[PDB]
Amino acid sequence: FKPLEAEEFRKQAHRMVDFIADYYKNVETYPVLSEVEPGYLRKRIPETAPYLPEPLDDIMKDIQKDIIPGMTNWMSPNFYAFFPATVSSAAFLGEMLSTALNSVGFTWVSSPAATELEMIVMDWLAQILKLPKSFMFSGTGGGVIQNTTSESILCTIIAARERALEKLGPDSIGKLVCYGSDQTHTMFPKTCKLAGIYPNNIRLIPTTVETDFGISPQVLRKMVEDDVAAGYVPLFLCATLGTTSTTATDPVDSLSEIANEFGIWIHVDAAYAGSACICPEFRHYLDGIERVDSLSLSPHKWLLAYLDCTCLWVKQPHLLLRALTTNDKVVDFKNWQIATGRKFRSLKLWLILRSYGVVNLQSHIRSDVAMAKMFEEWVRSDSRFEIVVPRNFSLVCFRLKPDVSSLHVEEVNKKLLDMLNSTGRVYMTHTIVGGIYMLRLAVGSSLTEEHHVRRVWDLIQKLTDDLL
Amino acid sequence: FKPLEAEEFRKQAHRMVDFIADYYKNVETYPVLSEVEPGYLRKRIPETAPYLPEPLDDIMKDIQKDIIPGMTNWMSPNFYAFFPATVSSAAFLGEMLSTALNSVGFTWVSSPAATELEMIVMDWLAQILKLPKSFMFSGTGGGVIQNTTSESILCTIIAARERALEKLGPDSIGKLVCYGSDQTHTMFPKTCKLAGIYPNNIRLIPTTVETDFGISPQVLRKMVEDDVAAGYVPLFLCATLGTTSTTATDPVDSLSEIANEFGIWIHVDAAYAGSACICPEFRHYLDGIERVDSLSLSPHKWLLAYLDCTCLWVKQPHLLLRALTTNPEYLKNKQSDLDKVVDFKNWQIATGRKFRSLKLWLILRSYGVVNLQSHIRSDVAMAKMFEEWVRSDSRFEIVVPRNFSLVCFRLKPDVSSLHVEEVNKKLLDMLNSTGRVYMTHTIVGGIYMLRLAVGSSLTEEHHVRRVWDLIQKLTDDLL
Ligand SMILES: N[C@@H](Cc1c[nH]c2ccccc12)C(=O)O
Ligand SMILES: N[C@@H](Cc1c[nH]c2ccccc12)C(=O)O
Ligand SMILES: [Ca+2]
Ligand SMILES: [Ca+2]
């Protein structure tokens, strides 16, 4: 019994490549969101694994018949929910090869090219973002490719916690206060809690439509000063560049000043919008980055990398390294993350950069921003709709105005979202901000072209005519 | 600019398939361990990314010329270091497809098939491991596919911590004590520190050659009772089934009885050896698993999955779920619910997730339980054979019993007038310098030993034979 034989591998893999290309060619045809009910797959797969081998033909048949029809097609050109997970063939080749090599790069020794290429690729990316040398290995800082935003933030939070605890002792853990926008409320508190921050020391900064739901420096300063007056230790601040709901932007320039002033570790989460900062017209959003303690952004969101791919830059690596242990030209990346093992994470990023070039990456950002701009202009031309909050990037938040119906505005927009999604011809999610229910169009799915967005607007108007 | 066009994709991906198959076909030819010096790759790549696109031909050339020669070839049939990362074409198909679909399965709604198939696969595997129904979604427990052992252990540690903190209040964190074998002192303490365990409340249980460096239950009981007497709260016990150094085995049956007695959450780390427990002649290592709080094993170690793939089962998911959320509404309701479907974001550190279960499903379906057992047995048989060869040479000695696929051995001290440790270190260095083999060493109980970690998917019987021949030749040269 040979699980890996090169020629059998070659045959089966070519067949899978063709199946995948056929899927990319057909997905526009499938309903974006699936109609299966919960538990449907339990009635279609046996309850125990087979003693005996099954032929690959049977498996592929079952995938087409029971798995894919049960999928939400994130790759559909008509997927506009959450944030697109953007892709590219260069990145897929990087994934294929990095997996096939299947190395574990916990140390430079356990695979030198992997570690060195990660350092190089992180410095490349730093230079495209025009970050100070204080974030670069060639300079005084560094970076690491993590899997997620959640674990990157957990790492920076633990670094800050450990600096505090070594200064003041472990029993000071009950004094440490962490701050995040009320717009990061489904992930930032979870991360703090994982780290042992007391429940009442996780503080959500209230925000209003008056700041476009970005953190108001005044508000955070008042909170920090009340906490210091009460004897607490302000420790960590998550500034979000592009919230998941409306892509609000916290002001890095002023918030980093408050952080520096109070010894607060400031981390900028730009999982989605950070990628736009490769374009000079978006780079002002990172003004003040030189004062910032850490920054992260997710290529597997808006930069053509598949899941997983999150970049984390740190200005003072030694604090992170100290935090993550119980005791030159190269690093051992096990020290920059939670676990020991690691894939060859940097290969696909290298392949993306080399294959496409900064020019095309900028073109790609700008093309998505242009299609969202166009869609917003369409929305403004229809007096029944309104843009609820400013479009800063690729996401348009919009809704039916209260005066189009005598029923509750929320119920009317919920019904419209339902009609749209039940069509199968589009997937969009909603959000609630400042008590206002709104629809979102998150433009960016790699296969989306301009006519897809045109057709979505046409569908929205058709269903709204039917609805009113 | 179209980063994704189906036909260009088809072309380039076919080309990469042919390249990858050629690498699998030729890797035995490359030196296993690389000779590059630190910083070698900086002198061969530009300091900045290019403005304009580069042709794929140039990139492939650079991968052949600057990357692969800088790799440690984990896929070589002559790689015997650490623990092998075993692979299979079924799993590679799962990786390709899981990636191409590029779904984000944070909730059931965000892709039903991904979540449902994960539940089914975890129950399949649980049954092959003959775990009680208390670890199954079809029963009263559950499981999740994580990336690593470190984050699985971290999650169970936080679950235990939060059970304590909700009982006693947050300021009691300074009383919570975690216990682990001194044979797991590189990963386990780091994890405890990450969860906020006070530095002095992370306790390594001393082990001796008298128990083959497995945890002595008596030792642990004495430690726990002294901690209770001093007012501490015993919280978490990490029992290791197959330590990284010598694949020592902590006794699940007695240790779990102790965990139950003192209210300690016991987690069984079976990253490597757990896969072997799919074979009846190894299932005894899980005797007592019904008393255990959580269990993990890594398919990307010994079950033909590529990196990453770690399976985690939990007997009381609600403790994990409470631990991993701040949601006031979920935390106020203290009951079990009628839902038949989960949102796996609640079972992990992050929100997003790949379609992780697909490749495991394809492994199980494509090979069958019988063949998977055959694979385990094949690696164990090659290791037993290698041990038998070593015992036939009176210059060498087996330092600790071979429990699975890893053989720990050394040159006896009396074979040379030099210090035994230096003699064995010189032998290891010569071996690795050959380029025809890679082995790591370990120090356990003050004893320096070489390790042979058999299992790399391309390794066949003649490879082990030739490694042993080489070892003997280099030993002859060395004396
Ligand atoms: N257990 C070995 C090797 C190892 C660690 N983590 C891994 C993950 C996958 C494969 C092998 C490993 C060690 O001491 O580091
Ligand atoms: N951002 C998504 C969830 C998410 C996490 N990671 C992602 C990566 C890609 C796309 C979406 C995600 C949300 O609003 O809940
Ligand atoms: Ca696009
Ligand atoms: Ca084998």
Side-chain angles (χ1 to χ4, degrees), chain B residues 380-448:
Chain B
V380 173
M382 284 180 71
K384 194 175 183 295
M385 185 177 65
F386 178 88
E387 172 192 10
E388 300 173 15
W389 295 336
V390 170
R391 294 185 185 278
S392 301
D393 190 323
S394 54
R395 300 172 305 184
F396 295 85
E397 82 174 16
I398 308 295
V399 177
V400 288
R402 174 207 59 77
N403 300 313
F404 306 95
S405 171
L406 158 67
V407 183
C408 299
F409 64 107
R410 80 197 266 241
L411 278 166
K412 287 184 174 174
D414 58 353
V415 303
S416 174
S417 59
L418 312 185
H419 192 274
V420 64
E421 188 170 313
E422 277 302 310
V423 179
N424 285 285
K425 213 186 315 302
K426 183 49 163 47
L427 178 61
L428 178 62
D429 203 300
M430 300 174 64
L431 287 166
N432 288 330
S433 301
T434 296
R436 299 175 63 100
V437 59
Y438 184 29
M439 301 164 47
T440 52
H441 76 94
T442 188
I443 302 289
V444 171
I447 302 175
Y448 182 101

Side-chain angles (χ1 to χ4, degrees), chain A residues 1 3, chain B residues 86 302 375 378-379 382 454-460:
Chain A
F1 168 62
Chain B
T86 64
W302 207 1
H375 142 72
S378 177
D379 293 346
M382 284 180 71
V454 180
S456 182
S457 295
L458 288 180
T459 304
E460 291 172 317

Side-chain angles (χ1 to χ4, degrees), chain A residues 364 367-368 444-446 448:
Chain A
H364 141 70
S367 179
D368 294 345
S445 183
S446 295
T448 300

